[PDB]
Symmetry: C3
Subunit: 456 residues, 3 copies
């Protein structure tokens, strides 16, 4: 169970509660990318240099096809087994493959028909001079085509049509080709060493197209709402289906799974405070996000997940375990909670939660302007609470604030709870501590062997 009162009295302030959702139904769509530049706009006087580019990309495209070769042949179906819905893998010659590799192979075997249809239609597609446009199909999936930055190359031909010779245009087109090749090598193409794994992020694709990804979502029919959460989660991934060395034809996957809310799922947000013990500033180590799910305490990492005031969805769902000490600290037990020292000049001395303020007067001033009696605090107090019964307007530091009324009798007063011993969090300090523990283990082993040698 979770005890909010215990966390409040320790020094941990509750934030906001969020829900948890799980992605499902991984529907996928294919996108076509052509490495060959468009035949319009660019003149043929530099096309010889283009031939060199045709070789250069080949040096990058020939091995990639070799990666795809001998892989699709390991999956087959229909050999007198049409009743089976799935396909029987024959990865004996493949040697080594993972679960992700097997799933990618199954997807490739399923989408081989679409890949062949796209390859057949490539002859007509190559004649499309439009910059960005949609593409119909057999009514199974809708495709699209984009001319990339090369479509803007014509915009650089209107100036100095005949003032600059063909050499300058060739140099400019070579510079543009080198820039595109460098961008592809940085965040596309052979960046993923294994093309049978779905690990392509939308950030790389955006960086290829000058940090833009809205066009693909609009073409595929995305949802305007919760766009920031989807972008932060990065649930959309991509993989290579087929590659054409001669034509520079590649296919990219776009997955838009639907989110389903987990019943009775709750995630808690907490923040620490800078309380006082004796003339010094102290803080408590507590994770900002706590996972509860269906009444089962667990740990979760929100570093690579979304942070929203109403929903928290993790793309990987690590679901890390939680130690017994952390569980005890979270529940109604304060002896298992650790504390650290803070020397920062600016600290969150006060905080607000559920209409109630939390701070300490051992280091910050406390005085009710409505009463002549100056508010004080005993030296053996860690935390304090304020209510409208004592005073209406309170002042912390140079900031005035007012609170409401307690939910019950309001007997919080200034109750304090003891905590565990402090310890350093620095990596070097942890290393020194564990080295000392290992050194003491020698004496421990010596005592153990002494207790079983002549101890009688």
């Amino acid at each position: 169970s979770l005890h909010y009162d215990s966390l409040s009295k320790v020094g941990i302030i509750k934030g906001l509660t969020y829900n948890y959702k799980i992605k499902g139904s991984p529907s996928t769509k294919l996108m076509v990318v052509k490495l060959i530049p468009n035949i319009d706009g660019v003149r043929n006087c530099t096309q010889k240099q283009f031939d060199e580019y045709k070789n250069l990309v080949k040096n990058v495209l020939e091995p990639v096809k070799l990666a795809l070769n001998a892989m699709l042949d390991n999956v087959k179906s229909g050999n007198n087994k049409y009743r089976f819905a799935g396909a029987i893998m024959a990865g004996v010659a493949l040697g080594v493959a993972t679960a992700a590799t097997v799933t990618a192979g199954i997807a490739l075997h399923r989408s081989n028909e679409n890949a062949q249809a796209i390859a057949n239609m490539k002859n007509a597609i190559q004649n499309t001079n439009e910059a960005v446009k949609q593409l119909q199909l057999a009514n199974k999936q809708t495709l699209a085509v984009i001319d990339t930055i090369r479509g803007e190359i014509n915009n650089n031909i209107i100036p100095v049509i005949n003032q600059l010779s063909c050499d300058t245009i060739g140099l400019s087109v070579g510079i543009k080709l080198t820039q595109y090749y460098s961008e592809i090598l940085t965040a596309f193409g052979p960046a993923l060493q294994n093309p049978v794994n779905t690990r392509i992020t939308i950030q790389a694709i955006s960086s290829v197209f000058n940090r833009n990804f809205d066009e693909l979502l609009k073409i595929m029919g995305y949802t305007s709402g919760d766009l920031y959460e989807i972008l932060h989660s990065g649930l959309i991934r991509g993989n290579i289906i087929d590659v054409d060395v001669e034509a520079g034809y590649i296919a990219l996957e776009i997955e838009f799974p639907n989110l389903t809310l987990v019943p009775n799922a709750v995630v808690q947000e907490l923040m620490p405070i800078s309380y006082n013990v004796d003339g010094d500033e102290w803080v408590t180590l507590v994770p900002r996000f706590v996972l509860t799910r269906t009444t089962l305490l667990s740990n979760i990492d929100t570093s690579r997940c979304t942070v929203t005031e109403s929903s928290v969805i993790c793309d990987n769902d690590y679901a890390l375990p939680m130690s017994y000490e952390l569980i005890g600290c979270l529940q109604g037990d304060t002896s298992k909670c650790a504390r650290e020292k803070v020397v920062s000049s600016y600290v969150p001395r006060f905080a607000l939660s559920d209409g109630l303020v939390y701070a300490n007067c051992l280091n910050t001033i406390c005085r009710c302007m409505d009463t002549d009696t100056p508010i004080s605090q005993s030296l053996g107090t860690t935390v304090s609470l304020l209510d409208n019964k004592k005073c209406l307007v309170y002042q912390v530091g140079d900031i005035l604030i007012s609170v409401g009324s307690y939910l019950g009798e309001g007997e919080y007063s200034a109750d304090n709870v003891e905590l565990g011993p402090p310890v350093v969090i620095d990596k070097i300090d942890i290393g020194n501590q564990l080295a000392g523990i290992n050194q003491t283990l020698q004496n421990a082993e010596d005592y153990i062997e002494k207790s079983e040698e002549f101890l009688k």
Copy 2:
């Protein structure tokens, strides 16, 4: 205290001493950003598409205003309490708020007059077609306006004025709008889930404007000197003051606090060396930067701070604590210092400090070309020192170097000091070690319970 001789004899070379400064007087300036495109340059034949954009940004701007709503109403002042300089908060209905949230609310309540003045002047500001310009006010703060990349859109209209139809211009302007929207979503706007927190960095603003930030600093009147240190520290932050859904009007904060030098503040720089014990290469684990302040040993993290040869300023001032073992190792005690093994082919065998060289001859060659006697070293030596008394020119590896004279009698010779046991620094090794310690804790608890059951 700090013992430089002990560090030198252990194997730690002193670098350079730096000062420490603290930011203060957080003066703030407001900057106005208009999401609506300029009325000049772009033709009206695509303005219908602009209307769709007017809806799209609304889907991103409507919730943000809801974030600002019901927040400023929680702070009020002047209700028969004009004598009070501050404002009395009424965050009872707010529910949960942090110290940063309270400070942001106070700042918003103070700057509401400026926000209202800016909103009133927006009618005249919208008629300003200038790309980048300044803006006067009531003589409290100076503002500015910038047309962003949209001002360059007109530069794309000079080519093909009538050769390309309105459809191409509309497509280009839509592509530009999508790129700007994607950039804003990446490094602006709703990236910060809580708009009542000052966590906007200048790097994001620069990425919005193609990695450029000098114009804002020049307009605000920054200081040319120490610009690199200010950029590295990132002391300038921003926050949202008000948002206009219809007009796309937003305000950004720019803080330029003044740095005050802490009296008697010193920060030390140290580097490790690759010494020898017996035919093997060994290194010592010591932090590169050591914080001393006003004669009080402490730990500091310079990863997110500045690194300058004359001053070190940390933006967050973590001021992490230091373990007793680290303090003992830093001072005149060598038994608390740990060592590790290094197998790298290239290592810093030699180093220079205060005109004195430090190296070991157990693995590197040592020979004075001015003397026929070949320099040697005993097998039980860890470190060695050289001086002009023995030879004038020394050779380490294939590099010749010369030193000066010692500060005193020069009796350093080849004194060595013992160190503690070694240990691995890898995370997996640390995990295995702590798992073994936990396993041994079972036997420890068994022995403890045996010692209190029948041990008599």
Copy 3:
């Protein structure tokens, strides 16, 4: 030694074996960069503003020269010692210097002749209006010159030649200059606080030139093959040789060392699996990459290295040590291996290696469609193996797969091996555990002092 069978039976699947290479023969080439804008294209009516830029860069260039001053004077040679191939350093006045600083000083002393030749030829080089071109020399090294983005500035002068006044052109050129200055400050120039250290990466240089680096490699004569591995390793570094404050003349180093294959060098790739113990999912902690070298177990970090199916080369070659527990777990000992709990919805239940599948039927369904007997598994089984002797086609989850034949008699069956106790990997959990260990150390010390006080 390495036991692949032990790893397979524990739950660790072998991947692919790679080689290891070491860089050598660090040949270096110089590249010239001119900060002064080209005299062609830009009109003189804005040149006055350029003068201000001439001052601005000076504020950034004057200290840098001071960094180079008094440094080259500390290295000298030829003073009646021409027979010596090296140079004798005189860094007594330098005070503090590292091994990298000494190497950089030696390189500067060696290349001072080339630097002087470049400075002398700068007078003729400044008259070169070509965008990018090569540059001959004394036949020791080939240089090059590049006009950067400024060469495209003329492309912005063709539109509105006389429609826009000189003020607009000056504003545009000032904006471009500010953008270039910001980019330089971000990823060039004074970013490296110590200019006597080689720590400039090619990523920063590419970011200066819009993420492009192929032109420099093509000019210097790079190798088309293994380009991705070279880019990932980042073996090419740079350093500042000389700086001209007035002319904005700087030199950058480009190193292209040759890779030599280490004899009998092997690096192993491994992946974990999600096995079962009793109705729960469990995983094993094992590093993905294992270093073996010439029959010597060691640890290596591939995070900042290359990942290729045929070769793995580390730029820094950390060569971290390995704990005894990890060595025991890797070899034929399972008691030293640790395990963790995983609650993720999607886990790699099955895997393939050497034509053999590995999975568990305790949580996933197992049934041979060719036989009416349903495949089952005992509750006390952790891992299982499948072969063509029992069934030809196997099904895991909703995926069908087939295997070949065992290398020997095929008596793997479903043998299981015990593992060590589990432990949490979270940093907070580790901190709590070490705090508890430190607390127990107090009782341990009390028992130790009791055993030497009156224990008789």
